[PDB]
Design a protein around this ligand. Structure first.
Ligand SMILES: [Cl-]
Ligand SMILES: [Cl-]
Lengths: 264, 264
């Protein structure tokens, strides 16, 4: 009877976390639709991105990046201005500043990188799929690196790719909202693992956030089981562990909610 | 021990249904942001609304309705055209046709009604709040009434109201996706109750969908307890009932997930 209680508890936490991530993914999904058919003035699009953050303090950043000349054919006019590259690609990034009330505009970085910090642009471009990135470090103004995950949709219509839109979670925030919750009678801990095996949240050791599963055999085990999509369980010293794969939005990769309960 | 198992089961179903409703509410929340700062050509906005339904078969309809001349000051030019009233208010309603693949455009009805069929426009206008309507019947082309609930956001910016955007669920669809799920070991039933006590889903008797709780004392009890926001339970002949109040998006009204489990 105690096992039933713990297992359904793990499933309840999985849907609570899925709800939270799906809400953010839903917002950025809906945001793209006017931009699949219209090209407003660039300043008004920046104001729209800024407004998401003004009225939603869950989120750290809101980003848009277009292919060359894909918004309005007018990149040359905006070369080397803020929110633009040296060719005038429209790449606004809005994010939290020194206070939450402060919202900063800068150029989106790394859309041309094959490193993990480019995944937010490159994976939607190559796969044409909605995509929650694995955790990555993103450098903002001030030489500060922000550990985050980004919920991305491609600007994809009439079988053509035009760019991406994205909403960011700072992982320090997710750790405080989820990572510190006790799953079962004020005991146990929660972990959220990305499809590549990187902790987005870790209630056992917060220093592991943004790190890969450290043991080679455990990482290999995780990678095999997680993308099969079925719930699984392991036992360690002290704990029973429940692993529930789930999707964010229409992204077909599996994230995993780990719920760990003491044997006592 | 059996009680713990049933109660956490009820909470797990509450978050699964909340996730589903929050995803749709998130989409329409995100959709509004470009329209808080830009006024694209009306035909492109209709194409954006149509596209939501093209790529999301969960949803029955997508609607936008502006205050007089609030989109572009050009209502007179569109008088008595489709998606417009006789004054040329921009009121496009896109919804499923004779097949799911068919998407129909007509004028949004009842934005000036003080009856329940006007709530989708009137309540966001008067309260300036995001709002999931109670279930209501909406008449489409062909003299067919569609029982639905609508997830609404106001077009609200700079302390001014400009209109609303909304995403509709057909309740017949919700009944098939949720209403028929068995909550506990293939036994029991689920019910989703609106803040005014109207069934959106009813796994005990599908004929009650769109109806108010029929017993006067039970309805009065429901209305008092549901908006206090705390979980509660009742016993009937055969069943233990669990009632979990929850919010959809940023709407402060409480919906209630009812999970009913046989005493056996
Ligand atoms: Cl979508
Ligand atoms: Cl919002």
């Amino acid at each position: 009877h105690h096992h039933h209680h713990m297992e359904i508890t793990a499933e309840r936490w999985t849907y609570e976390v899925k709800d939270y991530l799906d809400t953010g993914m839903g917002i950025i999904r809906g945001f793209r639709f006017p931009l699949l058919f219209s090209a407003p003035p660039r300043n008004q699009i920046i104001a729209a991105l800024r407004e998401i953050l003004k009225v939603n303090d869950h989120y750290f950043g809101a980003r848009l990046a277009y292919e060359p000349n894909s918004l309005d054919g007018n990149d040359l006019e905006f070369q080397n201005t803020l929110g633009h590259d040296s060719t005038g690609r429209f790449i606004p990034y809005l994010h939290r500043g020194q206070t939450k009330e402060e919202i900063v505009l800068e150029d989106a970085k790394y859309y041309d990188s094959l490193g993990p910090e480019g995944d937010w642009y490159q994976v939607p471009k190559k796969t044409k799929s909605h995509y929650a990135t694995d955790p990555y470090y993103y450098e903002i103004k001030g030489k500060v690196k922000i550990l985050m995950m980004s919920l991305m949709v491609p600007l994809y219509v009439n079988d053509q790719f035009y760019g991406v839109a994205g909403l960011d979670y700072q992982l320090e925030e997710l750790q405080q909202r989820i990572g510190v919750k006790k799953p079962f009678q004020d005991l146990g801990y929660l972990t959220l693992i990305s499809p590549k095996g990187i902790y987005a949240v870790n209630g056992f050791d917060s220093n592991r956030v943004g790190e890969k599963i450290s043991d080679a055999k455990e990482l290999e085990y995780y990678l095999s089981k997680s993308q099969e999509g079925e719930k699984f369980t392991t036992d360690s010293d002290g704990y029973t562990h429940y692993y529930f794969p789930f999707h964010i939005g229409k992204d077909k990769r599996y994230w995993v909610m780990q719920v760990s309960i003491p044997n006592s």
